Amino acid sequence: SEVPQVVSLDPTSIPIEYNTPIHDIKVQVYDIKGGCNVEEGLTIFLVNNPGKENGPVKISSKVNDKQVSEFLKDENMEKFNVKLGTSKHFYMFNDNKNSVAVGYVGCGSVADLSEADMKRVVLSLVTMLHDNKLSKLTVVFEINVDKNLFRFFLETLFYEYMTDERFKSTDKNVNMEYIKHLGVYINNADTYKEEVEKARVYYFGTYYASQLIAAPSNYCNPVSLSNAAVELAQKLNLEYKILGVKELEELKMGAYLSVGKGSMYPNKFIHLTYKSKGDVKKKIALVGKGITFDSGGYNLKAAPGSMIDLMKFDMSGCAAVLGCAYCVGTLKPENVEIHFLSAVCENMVSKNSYRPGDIITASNGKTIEVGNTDAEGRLTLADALVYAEKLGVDYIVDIATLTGAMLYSLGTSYAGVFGNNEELINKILQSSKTSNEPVWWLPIINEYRATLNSKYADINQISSSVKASSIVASLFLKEFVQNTAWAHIDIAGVSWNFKARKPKGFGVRLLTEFVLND
Amino acid sequence: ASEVPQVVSLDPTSIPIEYNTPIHDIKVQVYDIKGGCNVEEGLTIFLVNNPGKENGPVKISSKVNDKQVSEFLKDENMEKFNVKLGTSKHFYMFNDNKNSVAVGYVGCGSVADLSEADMKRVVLSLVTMLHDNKLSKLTVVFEINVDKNLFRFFLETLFYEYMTDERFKSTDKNVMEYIKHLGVYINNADTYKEEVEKARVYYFGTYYASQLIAAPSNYCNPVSLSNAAVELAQKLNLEYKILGVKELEELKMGAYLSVGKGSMYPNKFIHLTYKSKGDVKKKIALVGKGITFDSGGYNLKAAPGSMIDLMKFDMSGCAAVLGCAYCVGTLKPENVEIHFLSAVCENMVSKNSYRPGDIITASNGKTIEVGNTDAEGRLTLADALVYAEKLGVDYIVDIATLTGAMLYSLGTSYAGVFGNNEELINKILQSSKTSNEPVWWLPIINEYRATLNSKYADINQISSSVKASSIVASLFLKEFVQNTAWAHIDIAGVSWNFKARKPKGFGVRLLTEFVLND
Amino acid sequence: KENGPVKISSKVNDKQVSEFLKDENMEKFNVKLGTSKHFYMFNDNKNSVAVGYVGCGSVADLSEADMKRVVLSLVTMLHDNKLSKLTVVFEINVDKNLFRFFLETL
Amino acid sequence: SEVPQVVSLDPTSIPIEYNTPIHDIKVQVYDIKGGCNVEEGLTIFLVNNPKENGPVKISSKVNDKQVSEFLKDENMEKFNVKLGTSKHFYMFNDNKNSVAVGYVGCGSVADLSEADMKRVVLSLVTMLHDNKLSKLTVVFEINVDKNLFRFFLETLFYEYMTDERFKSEYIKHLGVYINNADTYKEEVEKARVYYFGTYYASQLIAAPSNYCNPVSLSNAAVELAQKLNLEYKILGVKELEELKMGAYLSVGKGSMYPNKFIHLTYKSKGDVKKKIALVGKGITFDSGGYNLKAAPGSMIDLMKFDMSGCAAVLGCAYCVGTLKPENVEIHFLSAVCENMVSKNSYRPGDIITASNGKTIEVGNTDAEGRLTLADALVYAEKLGVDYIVDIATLTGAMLYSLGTSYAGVFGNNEELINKILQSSKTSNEPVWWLPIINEYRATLNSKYADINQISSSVKASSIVASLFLKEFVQNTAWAHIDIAGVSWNFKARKPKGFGVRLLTEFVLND
Amino acid sequence: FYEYMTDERFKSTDKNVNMEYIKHLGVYINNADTYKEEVEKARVYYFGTYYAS
Ligand SMILES: N[C@H](CCc1ccccc1)P(=O)(O)C[C@@H](Cc1ccccc1)C(=O)O
Ligand SMILES: N[C@H](CCc1ccccc1)P(=O)(O)C[C@@H](Cc1ccccc1)C(=O)O
Ligand SMILES: N[C@H](CCc1ccccc1)P(=O)(O)C[C@@H](Cc1ccccc1)C(=O)O
Ligand SMILES: [Zn+2]
Ligand SMILES: [Zn+2]
Ligand SMILES: [Zn+2]
Ligand SMILES: [Zn+2]
Ligand SMILES: [Zn+2]
Ligand SMILES: [Zn+2]
């Protein structure tokens, strides 16, 4: 509970914004075939030209206004093209002689938009909402989208539009105002309508994870993070338990505790539970890596490209899991019991830190020789995994910013998934597809197992030879799940949006889809 | 006996030590080959060379008291095999008593005087014969010429290499039994019989050092290390004194204390004493470098090839000294007084650590400018040497994993010896020859002395210019021995067996031969 | 049983070698993937033959990598043999493809 | 041979000054007991205090009323004896003659080291450089070995000699006052020879690689041989190919300069009782090859010095050719080439065949020395000599093992090693015996070739390189002197000409 | 002043067994009667600099 402080100006909680301007947006969805009233604020058509690359903009929707209609006559729009991401703004007077702003975002030639295209599309739309004080946006859909994509559209629109100012003080945006109303025209209205509030929940889960990740390590430490989880659990009516050092010791979580030894913040193990009202048909343990700061320990992140300044993000996995708890706690799925777990600690350099070479004992009795204190994640997860399996769940899915190697394998767009069970991996895949958080299945190659053979301990933490460290890390983790379907999502490469200089909150939607569709 | 401080209750508070090794259960028997070879249960190995003829055929010279085995090992049957160094074969036959026997041979090359290291290759080949094969008995037949030392050496090496440290094994113990009988057939057996128990002592001394070295730095720390020394002293009836920080401060050991400042473990200075029953004719101080973990301090071991993960081994000198204490305490030499010394501490990074640039004062009043916190060994040794010489000894020999340069100079096989005294150096060199722990005499080049001229302090810890750091470290050390014959053995290169991934326990035999042949 | 004792099932048309392969002598060795032992001995013909095993672990399905480990162990015996023929007896379960891999790797 | 040229301004040879100012100096030696004359020039006393850095006190009787006052104890008490500390003053002598008088601090050390004596000779040299003098007179108020006395001389000459060849005065008389000046006279001209051999090596080393390339270097050796009446043979690529020197030729492949193998021979007049082959590493520039010297601290700019070994050997040829020892036949050898990056260079991974038929896998093109030496050693042994000594700036590791002061000696023969050590003692070029550790041999076991050039594992590269070289001497006493650490004087930014005296002493005493 | 002063606060065994400063500094300069004011300023400046040092 009580966050330790070195100086009274050290902050004692993570600032969190629950009531975002996004949440205040009154959303309306309409059937396209009833026609668009273009009345105020800004009214953007999403338009594609199926086939011809860089085609004309032709506005299909019947528009209930002679003047907007004349404006948008194919003739008038022909000069503008649809190159995905192009946008144009139009200013005119409608029927009641009321100046309206209109425009379109180019949606490309390909009539089925990829997740990445939909993103580039929202981004164009958000640059239209920035630097333009608007009370109302209206998006007319003149493209084919499935229900998940329109949900994604909204999730991304909400999340990209949002602008984290928690840490701003003298350099807040003096000229920032949010829309109060969002109008959406689409075909099949009724069907897409259900995606709206789902999107809003998904948005917040993601954004909430985002907020935790973005919170710097002085704000977001093991104590303040676990406090925030307790606060979230209380707001969602989730069962929660925070395991403190004494309990951790009793549970013999030596790998986890060893990582935290060097920190001024006592380890805190987060255990949230959501139980369905009905019969419980599926028990799931979601495990997030919760390193609130990763200095590397005595294996200090000193090497070029080690990005020590980014390491506040090493609790992204935990964030993903918490954001998911938000979503599941809000959407209240049936027939599931979900455990949200994170072995939270901070990996620091101290007289008290664990050293390279240390042999430590995991809660399952396996002794581990520490080859590198910067491979701390898998040590914390090891004990979290033993814990998860002791819960007697059907699935254990962990999500962790585990390996920098992910940048070299999948890059910044697709997370890696490893696991010991094909059905479970496929479930993650499907959840990847429906959440639009891209995940790729990577192999746990058993041949590498032998390089974890320690001369003194039961197991090495790291390989000496094998540079395929995401695989090796997975091999290591696999040793801590005895008999349960388990999957591991390495979001090290994807978690942080380097270009936008912010977290993605990656994994919240994925895990939620996973929980919801199982 | 002091409390091992702990961070968490899962932190171990002692080094686990195996005193009663399976090797102590081996009943060993030497028989003269004149008498002939009883070939029965177990495995009966011949050590055979073919003088001059490189990879020549195997010939069994010795009498075998069995028509059947004899017939089997008759020349016509043995020329399908060659004596190439370290090669081996397994034979299977039914003996004179209708009993099935396992006989074999290890090829001893073609040079009838195996060097220390060939013999190491020969043992290794024979160990592999003992591994994966539950034998109650090994019978070895020397059909090669070795001398007392070399014969011992084989026993000592065999014992050592056979033993398998499972102390840090939990779920990954090997399911591994040990021969309970060693039979040796050699010419002039009676002259060799005396080597057996000496080898067994030497083995354990070495193995004991090995145990300490291998113990990771969370297990083996200054408090637990000194506790183990106390325990060893108590078992051997040695006088002991452990100097704690208050006494160290009183003694003004600022160089030593500065190193430890950053550690959570208080410095502990180990002082063990063996005094002979008779008139004391020689007083020897053995000083071992006792850095239980060397992180490098603020000069963190972050550079490629700095091998931070190995740095539990930086107390090897202390280990060698302690193992030597075991041998001396056990073999009880006469007319000698031996002091076993190690200034034990841990070189860590902390708000309390000493910094590069700090000027610190040794117990002899010399002020030292710290140019690199990673050159900590010489600092601790400085104060240890001043202490040693205050004891009024005839010789001071320090042994220390002092400089990584040793890898560049002598490599992994031969330790470097430097000293201020030729007679003493020659004694170490003779001891090298008789212990078969290879050492090479390296110069203390006075020309380099000037690069230790600090602008502010009396002396620089490190050279700025001279890259010959083993020699520079030696020059630095020399400054702390005013008037006593002193040698320094740099075992940095040699202490860890990188290929086998284990300590060698290097120096125990060397130091014990040194002590004993005086 | 990981690192399980060796037990030869095949009947062999030799008395000496059958004796050598009995369960009592063979239980002294283990099946740790890649572990081998092998002895020279005289067969019912006073002919000089070598006999052993290569441990194939405790999994009834060998991977390619696992097979490579087995072959590598064989190939070791081979590089120190001035023998005339190799006989490999599969006391493990292998499909057509793995078997070709075994040969190609050997 | 015509050195090839990229441009009309590419030097086609190495400037060499043979007639150094140091030759026009007349050297005289007076028993100090007789007293000291102060007539002209500067007079330096070599004084020590056997009190650490204690007061100065001049011992010798001195033939000048007015200067003896300057030398009075209470005047000198103002000055100290700390190693290499000096002061000197101008004044007027007995005959109003502008004489300078001073001292050098010889520390408290009773017996001067090779090092401490350089510090004396350096302090003294400063004053020579800052002072326009006719004569310099040195007074020995300390103890010196005939060898240390000779060392004093050559160190003086050499440090005093300033190489001005690459730019766009000196005393004409040297006085020595020494206790027992009869024993020492013979050291003078020996010192002078030794000086020049060293200085000549120095000159070659210092010459940049555009000046000193394989063609110009061999040309210079030929010129030296001609001046000394030595037999000489330069092997060109056609002969090297016929001799199957593929290790050596591989290294040179990338160079615009054809390999040149220098073979000089001095044969004694009398019965030849000892045949010696001296082999010097002669890489005129070492870029590293495709293993380019790009790493921090690889000092690519220094790599003109990678023919130091060759220079040492040529300098020694000068001394031997000049001093004309008896009962020895000496072969001076260097497989000279340049290690360059080119479409024609050998690559890492190449397997090449030495002249003895051993195939070598090239693990690193920057470990080229041993490749050239291999072929040179096979050549040397074919000569049927009693000893082969190679000297080479072979391994940077030497800086980490012995540093900049002592060269490393490895060998396959104790007697020969001891001879080198004895030569080290008498030449005052410090050498230390390092082991060839056979345990490391196995890391030269190539999977494909007969042998690997480098270890993969072992970082003890001086030892590994020695193991590799050993492979190319079948049956002859052989020693290898690694002067990589010691060859260049980094502080003075010049070569030391290391090895010339060592090798000459070796030849002369054995 | 600054370059003449040796800092020995951190020696103890190192000497300095020779180092002893002049007691007198004489200067001879043109219109010295002006330069004279610079002397004590220099001494203050020296010590400020030396103190920082
Ligand atoms: N949270 C770290 C990886 C995340 C990351 C993301 C982007 C760029 C760089 C790093 P880590 O726990 O230090 C994991 C180590 C794994 C490791 C560390 C040290 C030795 C072996 C493996 C790594 O992948 O670098
Ligand atoms: N206990 C360390 C060396 C032991 C060792 C053994 C094998 C490989 C690497 C290192 P050290 O005290 O840091 C010795 C320092 C010496 C040193 C001297 C001056 C500056 C920095 C380091 C070093 O070798 O790194
Ligand atoms: N002409 C080089 C040594 C000269 C030298 C002297 C002092 C400092 C740096 C370099 P080398 O042939 O590249 C010898 C290599 C040895 C070597 C061996 C194997 C791989 C790479 C380099 C080296 O020590 O750098
Ligand atoms: Zn890490
Ligand atoms: Zn991490
Ligand atoms: Zn260190
Ligand atoms: Zn150390
Ligand atoms: Zn090179
Ligand atoms: Zn070179």
From Swiss-Prot, chain A:
Outcome (variant: A302P): 16-fold decrease in catalytic efficiency. No effect on hexamer formation
Positions contributing to Zn(2+) 1 binding: D294, D374, E376
GO BP: peptide catabolic process; proteolysis
GO cellular component, one term: cytoplasm
Main localization, broad class: cytoplasm
Cofactor binding note: Binds 2 Zn(2+) ions per subunit. Two metal binding sites with different affinities are located in the enzyme active site and can be occupied in vitro by different metals. Site 1 binds metal with low affinity and can be occupied by Zn(2+), Mn(2+), Co(2+) or Mg(2+). While Zn(2+) has the highest affinity for site 1, catalytic activity is the highest with Mn(2+) or Co(2+) and less with Mg(2+). Site 2 binds tightly to the metal ion and can be occupied only by Zn(2+) or Co(2+).
Pfam families named among the record's database cross-references: Peptidase_M17
Reaction equation(s) it catalyzes: Release of an N-terminal amino acid, Xaa-|-Yaa-, in which Xaa is preferably Leu, but may be other amino acids including Pro although not Arg or Lys, and Yaa may be Pro. Amino acid amides and methyl esters are also readily hydrolyzed, but rates on arylamides are exceedingly low; L-cysteinylglycine + H2O = L-cysteine + glycine
Binding sites annotated in the UniProt record for Zn(2+) 3: D309, M311, D314
Family: Belongs to the peptidase M17 family.
Biological role stated in the UniProt entry: Aminopeptidase which preferentially cleaves leucine residues from the N-terminus of peptides. Also, has some activity towards tryptophan and methionine and to a lesser extent towards phenylalanine. Has very low activity or no activity towards the other amino acids. In addition, cleaves the Cys-Gly dipeptide, probably as part of the glutathione regulation pathway; cleavage only occurs in the presence of Mn(2+).
Name under which the protein is recorded: Leucine aminopeptidase
Organism listed in the record: Plasmodium falciparum (isolate 3D7)
Organism classification: Eukaryota, Sar, Alveolata, Apicomplexa, Aconoidasida
Gene field: LAP
From Swiss-Prot, chain B:
Regulation of protein activity: Oligomerization is required for catalytic activity and is metal-dependent. The type of metal that binds the 2 metal binding sites influences catalytic activity and substrate specificity. In vitro, activated by Co(2+), Mn(2+), Ni(2+), Mg(2+) and Zn(2+) with decreasing strength. Occupancy of the site 2 is essential and sufficient for activating the enzyme but occupation of the 2 sites is necessary for full catalytic activity. Inhibited by fungal metabolite bestatin. Inhibited by Phe-Naphthyl (PNAP).
Region (L13 loop): 299-316
Catalytic activity as recorded in UniProt: Release of an N-terminal amino acid, Xaa-|-Yaa-, in which Xaa is preferably Leu, but may be other amino acids including Pro although not Arg or Lys, and Yaa may be Pro. Amino acid amides and methyl esters are also readily hydrolyzed, but rates on arylamides are exceedingly low; L-cysteinylglycine + H2O = L-cysteine + glycine
Impact after mutating D309A: 7.5-fold increase in catalytic efficiency. No effect on hexamer formation. 1.7-fold increase in substrate affinity
Xref: PROSITE patterns: CYTOSOL_AP
GO terms, molecular function: carboxypeptidase activity; identical protein binding; manganese ion binding; metal ion binding; metalloaminopeptidase activity; metallodipeptidase activity; peptidase activity; zinc ion binding
Keywords: Aminopeptidase, Cytoplasm, Dipeptidase, Hydrolase, Metal-binding, Protease, Zinc
Compartment(s): Cytoplasm
A biological process from GO: proteolysis
Annotated site location: Essential for hexamer stabilization: K301
pH dependence: Optimum pH is 8.5. Active between pH 7 and 11. Optimum pH is 8 for the cleavage of the Cys-Gly dipeptide.
Sequence positions that bind Zn(2+) 1: D294, D374, E376
Residues involved in Zn(2+) 2 binding: K289, D294, D314, E376
Name by which UniProt lists this protein: Leucine aminopeptidase
Gene source species: Plasmodium falciparum (isolate 3D7)
This protein's encoding gene: LAP
